[PDB]
Design a protein around this ligand. Sequence first.
Ligand SMILES: O=P(O)(O)Oc1c2c(c(OP(=O)(O)O)c3c1[C@H]1C[C@@H]3c3cc4c(cc31)[C@H]1C[C@@H]4c3ccccc31)[C@H]1C[C@@H]2c2cc3c(cc21)[C@H]1C[C@@H]3c2ccccc21
Ligand SMILES: O=P(O)(O)Oc1c2c(c(OP(=O)(O)O)c3c1[C@H]1C[C@@H]3c3cc4c(cc31)[C@H]1C[C@@H]4c3ccccc31)[C@H]1C[C@@H]2c2cc3c(cc21)[C@H]1C[C@@H]3c2ccccc21
Ligand SMILES: O=P(O)(O)Oc1c2c(c(OP(=O)(O)O)c3c1[C@H]1C[C@@H]3c3cc4c(cc31)[C@H]1C[C@@H]4c3ccccc31)[C@H]1C[C@@H]2c2cc3c(cc21)[C@H]1C[C@@H]3c2ccccc21
Ligand SMILES: O=P(O)(O)Oc1c2c(c(OP(=O)(O)O)c3c1[C@H]1C[C@@H]3c3cc4c(cc31)[C@H]1C[C@@H]4c3ccccc31)[C@H]1C[C@@H]2c2cc3c(cc21)[C@H]1C[C@@H]3c2ccccc21
Lengths: 19, 9, 221, 219
Amino acid sequence: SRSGLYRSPSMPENLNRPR
Amino acid sequence: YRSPSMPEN
Amino acid sequence: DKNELVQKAKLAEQAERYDDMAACMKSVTEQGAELSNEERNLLSVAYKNVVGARRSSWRVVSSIEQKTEKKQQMAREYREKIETELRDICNDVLSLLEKFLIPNASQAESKVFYLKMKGDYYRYLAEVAAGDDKKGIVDQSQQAYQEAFEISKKEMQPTHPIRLGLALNFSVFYYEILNSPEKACSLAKTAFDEAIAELDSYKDSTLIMQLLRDNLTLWTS
Amino acid sequence: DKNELVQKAKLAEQAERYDDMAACMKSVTEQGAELSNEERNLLSVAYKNVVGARRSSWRVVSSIEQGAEKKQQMAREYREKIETELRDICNDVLSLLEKFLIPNASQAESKVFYLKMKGDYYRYLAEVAAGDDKKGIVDQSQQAYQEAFEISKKEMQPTHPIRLGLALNFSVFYYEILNSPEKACSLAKTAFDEAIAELDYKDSTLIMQLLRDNLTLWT
Ligand SMILES: O=P(O)(O)Oc1c2c(c(OP(=O)(O)O)c3c1[C@H]1C[C@@H]3c3cc4c(cc31)[C@H]1C[C@@H]4c3ccccc31)[C@H]1C[C@@H]2c2cc3c(cc21)[C@H]1C[C@@H]3c2ccccc21
Ligand SMILES: O=P(O)(O)Oc1c2c(c(OP(=O)(O)O)c3c1[C@H]1C[C@@H]3c3cc4c(cc31)[C@H]1C[C@@H]4c3ccccc31)[C@H]1C[C@@H]2c2cc3c(cc21)[C@H]1C[C@@H]3c2ccccc21
Ligand SMILES: O=P(O)(O)Oc1c2c(c(OP(=O)(O)O)c3c1[C@H]1C[C@@H]3c3cc4c(cc31)[C@H]1C[C@@H]4c3ccccc31)[C@H]1C[C@@H]2c2cc3c(cc21)[C@H]1C[C@@H]3c2ccccc21
Ligand SMILES: O=P(O)(O)Oc1c2c(c(OP(=O)(O)O)c3c1[C@H]1C[C@@H]3c3cc4c(cc31)[C@H]1C[C@@H]4c3ccccc31)[C@H]1C[C@@H]2c2cc3c(cc21)[C@H]1C[C@@H]3c2ccccc21
């Protein structure tokens, strides 16, 4: 659903170091 | 860690 | 042009650009007229996001400095870099509060709110101050909060979210800055109890009450 | 020293200070040496966060541009401010790719990684391009992906997360830059099936889920 909050469903920034 | 103060909203 | 800067600040908020939002609301404040409730909220939201980012960032880098040979030098030099941004942000807000916002505040509501804010931003400097200026900055924070506390006891209902919010933050000052869990717990408990007493038209108050009680339950067992 | 800058970039990452992170990893790239797997991901993560915040705010502000007269000139002007930041960021990344990264990639893996980035950042310019430059900017994005796709298909196994990652993004290019629900669903479905076919690590299976989520959505 395309509104002003819509994210393009490409590669996200996952598998990185959380604390 | 969070400081349990007033949030924004 | 005061109206246009406010509309620009609202756009920045939607855009989640907080430095822009801050810049705009700073300029509004600098025109010297008393802020509306909406302008007040935009100002505080803006700077809270700006200061908040540095605070979290400071905490993370502080954690690393402890756990880190001369690699822990680099963390320290980065922490210092983050502090000078933090201190400049706090000193901006504090100037606005002295030169404009606190003197023009014509209602108790506005005065408590801006004194609370003053308390908050000295509390942020105190979190990050060295032992020479710490107790002096801690003092300023405690005064501002105390003055706000007195005014809101005489002038505002126990359910007023600004009074409850002051209570919440002032508890936190006592717990985190001075090391008094029971002095913090008292303030939060009475504020909460006093609010429950006035029950027997706002939903933000009950949210703040829930936060008060969450701090109690945490801070003691 | 390269190791100083790389370790700063990691501190900057943990601090969520992505302008600092990107600056550090730019300096590393500018020293002319081929980056490690760690270094290219640091660079990629940094710039993706820096450009991503502009893309997000651009969309919100453009969407407000959809009423009055003087209010919507201000949104327009602000959008333009955001675009000019967005383009400066995209053009920093593309210069690094042209002058250092793409010409020094000794392996097919990193060649495909960088050609995908080139694709990505030209796609971000294309989202923000006007009537004139769009078709030319849009085709630069396409060539970058196409070359990446070709190298990927002969040199890399279908489960490799760079191959799958390229596919997801190249699918998204087709879908929203070129209005081809067909050529997007084609790319994505083959990549998924070809990766399913060669189950005989954790990143691969996640990108596979993302690829199918895009098919599921676009049906
Ligand atoms: O006993 P621990 O679980 O290891 O926690 C304490 C720590 C530490 C402690 O020493 P300190 O207070 O002089 O910094 C303490 C603790 C326990 C014992 C002491 C301490 C003090 C405090 C608290 C818990 C602890 C509550 C009340 C007071 C406090 C201030 C700020 C947030 C939370 C608290 C060190 C080491 C550790 C710690 C963690 C941090 C930090 C520093 C430390 C920096 C970065 C992060 C942080 C979060 C919030 C504010 C500041 C920081
Ligand atoms: O953060 P600091 O300003 O360096 O304060 C701590 C101190 C000390 C700390 O180590 P400690 O665990 O052996 O007491 C600490 C702190 C900070 C970091 C650690 C600590 C622990 C704790 C708190 C703050 C701190 C909150 C939560 C926990 C605590 C217990 C009792 C009252 C208040 C607290 C030393 C040195 C200093 C301190 C002060 C006192 C005492 C001891 C100290 C004696 C006498 C007085 C005191 C008051 C209340 C109870 C007991 C005491
Ligand atoms: O009919 P809708 O459900 O309200 O969605 C469409 C819209 C609009 C449409 O017109 P457009 O084609 O010129 O963008 C469309 C839609 C539906 C019909 C047409 C459109 C085109 C497209 C899509 C959905 C729609 C998918 C494939 C293509 C597309 C591009 C980028 C993201 C998602 C898509 C306007 C109005 C609305 C819209 C929303 C946005 C935007 C513009 C609009 C801006 C800001 C936000 C946005 C998200 C992502 C990129 C760009 C934007
Ligand atoms: O991104 P745009 O250059 O604004 O493309 C759109 C157009 C048009 C749009 O309006 P429309 O919905 O009434 O056709 C749109 C677009 C964008 C915004 C709206 C639109 C709608 C849609 C898509 C993109 C767009 C994706 C999702 C939806 C769609 C249906 C079929 C294929 C692809 C899509 C007009 C003008 C243009 C267009 C092109 C064509 C056609 C019509 C148009 C005819 C002939 C060719 C075509 C291809 C496939 C099916 C039908 C056609």
